UniProtKB/Swiss-Prot annotation, chains A, B, C, D, E, F:
PANTHER family (alphabetical): FERRITIN, FERRITIN LIGHT CHAIN
Localisation per UniProt entry: Cytoplasmic vesicle, Autophagosome; Cytoplasm; Autolysosome
Encoding gene, per UniProt annotation: FTL
This protein's name: Ferritin light chain
Domain Ferritin-like diiron span(s) in chain numbering: 6-155
Domain of life according to the entry: Eukaryota
Principal place of residence: cytoplasm
Length: 171, 171, 171, 171, 171, 171
């Protein structure tokens, strides 16, 4: 058996592996979003940078989960990573909407894992999530909603011009 | 059509997408190797760090290929990423052997893409590969072979003790 | 005969002279583009600066080719330089389109010279081009395509206002 | 019509365009002189540098004229540039003599334009020329005459040896 | 067999060994040239230094080839080194002519090895040569031709005096 | 005859030339030893560095002898250099034993030359050797014997493990 494992359920161990897969999928989605905005026929550098930075953040999140898995005496198990849900991501508001969907899905997975840890009386897990993930997600989703409101307000006025201004003056 | 694309074949465009998938798969394999060596029942920090650094290098390689795809006017297309070939990676020599196999597979893919670019009279591709990939792979494979020789020499003597010394004094 | 010339064909020597003429013509075209955008009835300083900087880059390219001609033992021969294809260059998108045409013509000349050097088994020429010209052209054409997309997106919205914003916020 | 143009005759506007062509031709001539002295069978680095620096000075002069054209509300018009008068430039004294001929031709063009501006009662033009061109030409022609005297004195003694010494100790 | 060797032909491996022998022979030739110019009855320090520096450069070139041999998984094999072709090297122009002959022989060996690598579809070899050897040789041969022209021009005038001036003012 | 030569026998002059050949042969032997330890199937970096540094030291020794030859008014004469006595150098103790043999052969040549200078009443030669060569050899041979004792003590215990430890902790 494991020489360090203590109070760490098989249910949480498996849920952590699943959450790593979700974070890695999210990183992959952001990689695709970033390089789409880098295309010469899209060409919105601030948008490209926004999403490439998020790809790195989600990879960091997976790495933190993996480190914790090992700290607790669980075993990291990796599964196939599904490709992103789109090959082309539309306009800036389309992309920001997709990102908000993706983050809410990550947040609901965090909340579900939190509920599981609370059911399993695993306060280390519950602290880990609260400390490194839950407020990060709330902050990020607030930022994204702020961005979406701004983008929508701009492209409602004049779509091309508004998308340019947002990229130049916000991102 | 594309406003910048010039001398960039559909064959090379598709081969670049495939090579990105290979680099991303390699990064994933190294992620798994790294966290395996971080397990409390494996516990070889230098080995863990060696492989986690390689995971980052392969991700950088994918990003460079994606950037080039867009510079040339091609379209990045992402596919599902297959999980690594093992869940547990054995001893240090087992892991180093697997890494050498993986690098040789990347190198042969680079060489094949190079041959294709030469067939397609695409000197920008050929320069890109030579400049950023081909010598990197040769250097890395030489390092890995040096490491393997050292590990084998050590574990032939006394397996536990030799693995510890390698991790402490080389890595 | 020449005391240093070695593996340097008469065909490549002549093609290098022709390419110098092309680079000098390009520099002249950019000089004209730059000063057109400096006119008090055009008055787009960022555009003026963009093109004047390109005039200097193309002159640098001619000078590098001339230096190489002499390094190889060939003889620089100069021909008349044709004036630019227009006296007035229209709007920003008109000018950016013309620039992309001009760069693609330079790039195809580089590629043709590369093919010739490969036919003549002249690896020094092939390395020289790859090192100093081919990636520079790919980067520049990508930048220009990014700019064109942005300009078009802006002037589609509102032509005067969009042209101003591009010059102010991108250039 | 032009919103800024004031006291700027069509005659001066056209003469300024012609003078730009003369400056650009001169720059081209110096480019050729410079690279001739860079040939491995000529190999006088100080001479090469002397003339390449002059090529840059004459380009600066054209740019100053173009800037002024626009400041005054005139329209820059470019014509074909004739290739230099020779493909090979002889010995150092031959080259210095050619340069003095070329500068005197530029100076006489400046003086003619000055006389025209005085006929047209255009004191801004007259000040511009006096400030940026006329004393520059007098200084340069004096330097060139000093150089020629020195070269002639040296090559009268012993031609090869004198040409070397001049390049080493003056240039 | 070799654990790292990949795409590295026996033909290139042997040709690299031969080229090392050529570089080492060249270094030896330059050692002899350098110490000849150090003789009290020759006494041209700048010439001595020119050639001793070249002896070191050629040794560096051999070392780079040897390093690459091992990086690729080939086996360095050394052969007897033939003594230089002369015991005494004449005047400065005699020595510079010999050096140009020697460099052209090195350059033709590089070109031949390049052609072989291209026949063997070995792009790493081809990049290695282009990157570290081919432009170095072109630059060096250009310098040597410049020097020879200068020396010849000087000793045509007055042989003793010209040789002194070259050593003092160029070297 | 020579204008500076004084008290410098033909016997010593010839013996100095022979000793240069011995030093150059030794440098070549160390070059081969160094690159053997750089092979991916040998892979002992500290050993490689030890011997490559010695190759440079022996070349320095040849250069000092050549400089002295000229200071004394003798004439440097170079002979063919024989390749090293082995193509592969075995284990670390095998290599260190070979090095000690080689150094003792250099030292006996120094001692013989010293005896000759004493027979020829040449105190400058005798001082030169004592000052720059004889104590260097004694120090180096002592170091090598220290190393050999350590290596032997280690590989007697456990051969692979001991060779690794020596390279890591001594070299």
């Amino acid at each position: 058996s494991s020489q360090i494992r203590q109070n760490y359920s098989t249910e949480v161990e498996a849920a952590v592996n699943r959450l790593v897969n979700l974070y890695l999928r999210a990183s992959y989605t952001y990689l695709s979003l970033g390089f789409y905005f880098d295309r010469d026929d899209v060409a919105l550098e601030g948008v490209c940078h926004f999403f490439r930075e998020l790809a790195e953040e989600k990879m960091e999140g997976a790495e933190r989960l993996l480190k914790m898995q090992n700290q607790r005496g669980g075993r990291a198990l990796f599964q196939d990573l599904q490709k992103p849900s789109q090959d082309e991501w539309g306009t800036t508001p389309d992309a920001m909407k997709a990102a908000i969907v993706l983050e809410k899905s990550l947040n609901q997975a965090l909340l579900d894992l939190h509920a599981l840890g609370s059911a399993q009386a695993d306060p280390h897990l519950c602290d880990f999530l609260e400390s490194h993930f839950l407020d990060e997600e709330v902050k990020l989703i607030k930022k994204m909603g702020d961005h979406l409101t701004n983008i929508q307000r701009l492209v409602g006025s004049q779509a091309g011009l508004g998308e340019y201004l947002f990229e130049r003056l916000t991102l």
